Design an enzyme around this catalytic site. Structure first.
Site, PDB file in Angstrom:
ATOM      1  CB  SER A  93      -0.949  -0.003   1.150  1.00 50.78           C
ATOM      2  OG  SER A  93      -1.762  -1.160   1.081  1.00 50.78           O
ATOM      3  CG  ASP A  99      12.155  -9.211  -1.556  1.00 47.59           C
ATOM      4  OD1 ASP A  99      12.392 -10.193  -2.304  1.00 47.59           O
ATOM      5  OD2 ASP A  99      11.080  -8.611  -1.523  1.00 47.59           O
TER       6      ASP A  99
END
Ligand SMILES: NCC[C@H]1CN=C(O)c2cc(-c3cccc(OC(F)(F)F)c3)c(-c3ccccc3)n21
EC number: 2.7.11.1
Length: 270
Positions: free
Chosen positions: A16, A132
């Site tokens: 988000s 990541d």
């Protein structure tokens, strides 16, 4: 306070992130919302306030250095946290950039990959492991030709001991995690940079399935130099101990004569 300091624009792109402006000086920002019920790893600020690990990590790597996305501010809400992040303008993520152009020329891949290595090194220097590293988590400041790491939401404090948790991208995860659910931060990071570099020069990741990761056989689907092939194959050694260190990567013959970010922008980005 939030709505008093930041004008919220629309969604950008399960995560988000909204476009934003700082009403103070009209500085472009990104507003990341994280709901407390969805947070797995909690850290604690010096003040011993329980925050998301991402705040800890971003606070530890937030200085002059342009290679990591600056956390400008953060807020607690009843059921969520809200991170204010710098937003370059114009800007493209490396995933969309590789999709548009296909395989990058080696010269540009070298400049990009160098900048990512410098950024990952800075994270490690400040006790942060990203976990990541992937095309999607790299923003290109198109005017300055500068890359910036984003999304420390799967990150951890750097430790020299075994990691037994991982919440990052599987197709970027190393064989030792697939097989034995165990890895060391730096060696696993060198694996992901191997995947990243392959992706930059081939226009796609090398492995889809666990079996492909575990076998670690690298087929080049594009013309890639012998030296770049060697560096990728080396980063992608099955045995962690056999992977290069950051020093060994940056001293590799393929990594020499890197372009300055501005040079990179002038030649490849505009
Ligand atoms: N998949 C990427 C992960 C998503 C979800 N987690 C995050 O931590 C995150 C942070 C941001 C971000 C950061 C700084 C500026 C920014 O604005 C800009 F894109 F430059 F306009 C976005 C994005 C994101 C990037 C690009 C597009 C959409 C969101 N993410």
């Amino acid at each position: 306070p939030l709505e008093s300091q930041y004008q919220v624009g629309p969604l950008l792109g399960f995560g988000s992130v909204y476009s934003g402006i700082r009403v103070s000086d009209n500085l472009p920002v990104a507003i990341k919302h994280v709901e407390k019920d969805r947070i797995s790893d909690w850290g604690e600020l010096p003040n011993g306030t329980r925050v998301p690990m991402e705040v800890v990590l971003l606070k530890k790597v937030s200085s002059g250095f342009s290679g990591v996305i600056r956390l400008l501010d953060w807020f607690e809400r009843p059921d969520s946290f809200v991170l204010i992040l710098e937003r370059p303008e114009p800007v493209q993520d490396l995933f969309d950039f590789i999709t548009e152009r296909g395989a990058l020329q080696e010269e540009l891949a070298r400049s990009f990959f160098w900048q990512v290595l410098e950024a990952v090194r800075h994270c490690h220097n400040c006790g942060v492991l990203h976990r990541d590293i992937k095309d999607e988590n790299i923003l290109i400041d198109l005017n300055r030709g500068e890359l910036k790491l984003i999304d420390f939401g799967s990150g951890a404090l750097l430790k020299d001991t075994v990691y037994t948790d991982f919440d990052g991208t599987r197709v970027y995860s190393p064989p030792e995690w697939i097989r034995y659910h165990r890895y060391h931060g730096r060696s696993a990071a060198v694996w992901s940079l191997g995947i990243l570099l392959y992706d930059m020069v081939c226009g796609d990741i090398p492995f889809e399935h666990d079996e492909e990761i575990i076998r670690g056989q690298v087929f080049f689907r594009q013309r890639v130099s012998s030296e770049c092939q060697h560096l990728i194959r080396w980063c992608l050694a099955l045995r962690p101990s056999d992977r290069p260190t950051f020093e060994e990567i940056q001293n590799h013959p393929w990594m020499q004569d890197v372009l300055l970010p501005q040079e990179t922008a002038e030649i490849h980005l505009h």
